[PDB]
């Protein structure tokens, strides 16, 4: 009847007259306010729209289970639903990401920030993107499918998502336009690899072809991070090639560059699949090989920064062994191969033989095929004790090689024709060598 509409119209205006109270905190009440909203829709087929109510209750339902939700909309359509729903979604997702630790940095803010902080902001972002892909985008598809009873649902998922995508793409651009700094390589790759996931996840959750526009942006963003990775790695190779220091490493110790460069290349290999896809043995293989060539070529010229040819060798040994150890003790050895490693061992083998000849030939001349060789020996011991051979095994074998030549040769020379050092004195003084400290004897 028209009286069944009057009663329906009544309680709506009663509820309209108090927007303070929400309809969805009263058991028998919320049951009644639906039946009224149904008769409005029935009558048309006063405005008595009460949508302003249902639109605000839905807002106050999604913000503080999802059963009141999927009933608010069946009565709402029979547009303003979509625009409202999508809004609150866009808002709540904005807050999730803020909590996660997603800033919207400017270009100036990015360029001025100290690496230690930018590092932690990128770290936060990768975590955020992982969450968005593996949790949120799926959750927002589940909600639209359950809540909305139209397929509109395609529009709602995308409009619920765009804001969330755009906000991560912002910081993607921030790092994309940042000055190229080797520091950042590993992080940019973490970001690239994280962001790559979005497309698969979005392709699985989007039925229609409106998800192509968002996928286009994400691609263009990925491709720029793709550019940022090629440029960063280039800057590393560029700065390595430019390095020309003529300060000799004291005690012939391992050069810090050798430590840094090899640490860097060892870390790249953790990103083989990405780096192989972006660069154009593996493309990374070719690059790793080139970069290590530059390091060797640089270190060879640093070995010529000595008056003593012996220290040139000790330096080349120590640094070339460290390189080979880091290659063999990682997936580097696998990539550039055995033949590469065998050759370096060859070079290290020859460098040691070069030392033993160069340093111990005049000392073995002071005994023939009065003769004071004490100055020769004292001078070697004097400063070769302050030298360093870091590797215990190599240090041991150089000493054993030295002694086995010099000691028996001295037992003969003295034992025949004889007056300062006994052969035991020399054995003990030989054991003090390469300890990076002046030996106790004098």
């Amino acid at each position: 009847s028209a009286a069944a509409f009057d009663a329906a119209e009544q309680l709506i205006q009663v509820w309209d007259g108090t927007p303070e109270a929400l309809v969805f905190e009263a058991t028998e009440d919320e049951v009644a306010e639906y039946l009224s909203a149904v008769d409005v829709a029935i009558e048309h087929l006063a405005m008595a729209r009460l949508e302003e109510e249902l639109r605000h209750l839905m807002v106050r339902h999604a913000v503080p289970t999802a059963r009141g939700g999927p009933l608010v909309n069946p009565f709402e359509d029979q547009r303003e639903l979509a625009d409202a729903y999508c809004g609150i979604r866009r808002d709540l997702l904005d807050e999730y990401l803020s909590a996660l630790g997603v800033e919207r940095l400017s270009i100036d803010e990015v360029q001025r920030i100290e690496w230690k902080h930018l590092n932690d902001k990128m770290k936060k972002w990768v975590q955020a993107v992982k969450t968005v892909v593996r949790v949120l985008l799926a959750g927002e598809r589940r909600l639209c499918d359950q809540v909305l009873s139209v397929s509109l649902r395609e529009e709602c998922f995308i409009e619920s998502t765009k804001g969330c995508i755009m906000q991560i793409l912002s910081f993607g651009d921030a790092v994309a336009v940042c000055p190229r700094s080797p520091e950042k390589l590993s992080r940019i790759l973490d970001m690239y690899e994280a962001l790559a996931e979005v497309i698969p996840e979005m392709k699985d959750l989007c039925l229609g072809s409106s998800g192509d526009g968002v996928i286009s942006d994400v691609q263009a963003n990925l491709d720029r991070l793709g550019d940022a990775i090629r440029g960063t790695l280039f800057e590393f190779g560029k700065v390595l090639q430019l390095e020309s220091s003529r300060r000799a490493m004291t005690a012939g110790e391992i050069h810090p560059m050798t430590r840094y460069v090899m640490n860097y290349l060892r870390l790249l290999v953790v990103y083989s699949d990405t780096l192989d896809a972006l660069l154009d043995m593996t493309p990374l293989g070719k690059r790793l090989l080139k970069l290590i060539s530059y390091l060797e070529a640089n270190l060879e010229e640093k070995s010529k920064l000595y008056e003593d040819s012996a220290l040139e060798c000790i330096f080349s040994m120590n640094n070339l062994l460290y390189i080979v150890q880091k290659v063999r003790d990682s997936e580097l050895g696998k990539i550039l191969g055995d033949h590469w490693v065998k050759r370096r061992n060859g070079k290290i083998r020859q460098y040691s033989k070069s030392y033993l000849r160069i340093s111990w030939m005049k000392v073995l001349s002071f005994l023939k095929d009065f003769k004071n060789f004490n100055l020769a020996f004292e001078e070697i011991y004097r400063n070769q004790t302050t030298w360093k051979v870091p590797d215990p095994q190599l240090r041991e074998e150089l000493k054993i090689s030295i002694s086995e030549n010099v000691i028996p040769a001295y037992r003969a020379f003295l034992g025949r024709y004889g007056i300062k050092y006994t052969p035991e004195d020399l054995e003990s003084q030989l054991s003090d060598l390469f300890e990076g400290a002046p030996g106790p004897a004098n």
Binding site: V239, E243, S245, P256, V261
Partner: peptide, 27 residues
């Protein structure tokens, strides 16, 4: 006869720290 373990060919920049050298901009 440089006084730092790292020295740039292009700009003057030198340092005994590799990280500082490898992330230096050529001035």
């Amino acid at each position: 006869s440089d006084t730092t373990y790292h020295k740039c060919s292009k700009c003057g920049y030198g340092s005994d720290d590799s990280d500082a050298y490898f992330n230096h901009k050529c001035n």
